[PDB]
């Protein structure tokens, strides 16, 4: 349980990590671009999107707490494979990969995405890090400019 799930997140940071590091030494020794924006129709509804089913996620998270494979794991993982693939749309838009690695919600995402597909591979009711999701809500103020409410 304590290294079962967090395995994952583990190797998939340090996966991630390696592939920076060789990426930069064979340096050295786009769409998504336009998806990942500011007043963008196609950005503005992306990012309000992954906030709400965030929010979702976070809400059946407490159900999963308060209860202490399920129709709400199957729910999760719909929520996960939307946020990993904006995590790589995200990613391919990112200028830089060494510097994207390390942001807020990159980590966010890897101490609840692999570790939830672990989860629901072997059917397990691990509570998991999937409050780090609650992190999404830093994204409000944005939104909120978006909405011109702000």
Same mark, same amino acid.
């Given at each position: 349980?304590?290294?079962?799930?967090? /395995?994952?997140?583990?190797?998939?940071?340090?996966?991630?990590?390696?592939?920076?590091?060789?990426?930069?030494?064979?340096?050295?020794?786009?769409? /998504?671009?336009?998806?990942?924006?500011?007043?963008? =129709?196609?950005?503005?509804?992306?990012?309000?999107?992954?906030?709400?089913?965030?929010?979702?996620?976070?809400?059946?998270?407490?159900?999963? /707490?308060?209860?202490?494979?399920?129709?709400?794991?199957?729910?999760?993982?719909?929520?996960?494979? #939307?946020?990993?693939?904006?995590?790589?749309?995200? #990613?391919? /838009?990112?200028?830089?990969?060494?510097?994207?690695?390390?942001?807020?919600?990159? #980590?966010?995402?890897?101490?609840?995405? +692999? +570790?939830?597909?672990?989860?629901?591979?072997?059917?397990?009711?691990?509570?998991?890090?999937?409050?780090?999701?609650?992190?999404?809500?830093?994204?409000? +103020?944005?939104?909120? =400019?978006?909405?011109?409410?702000?």
């Amino acid at each position: 349980q304590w290294y079962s799930f967090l /395995a994952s997140s583990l190797v998939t940071f340090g996966s991630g990590l390696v592939v920076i590091i060789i990426y930069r030494i064979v340096l050295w020794l786009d769409w /998504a671009g336009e998806l990942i924006s500011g007043q963008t =129709t196609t950005g503005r509804i992306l990012v309000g999107l992954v906030f709400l089913l965030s929010i979702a996620s976070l809400i059946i998270y407490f159900i999963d /707490a308060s209860t202490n494979s399920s129709t709400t794991q199957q729910v999760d993982l719909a929520f996960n494979v #939307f946020f990993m693939i904006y995590f790589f749309i995200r #990613f391919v /838009a990112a200028n830089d990969k060494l510097w994207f690695w390390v942001e807020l919600f990159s #980590f966010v995402d890897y101490f609840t995405i +692999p +570790p939830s597909f672990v989860a629901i591979y072997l059917d397990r009711n691990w509570l998991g890090l999937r409050f780090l999701r609650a992190l999404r809500l830093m994204s409000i +103020p944005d939104i909120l =400019t978006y909405l011109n409410v702000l």
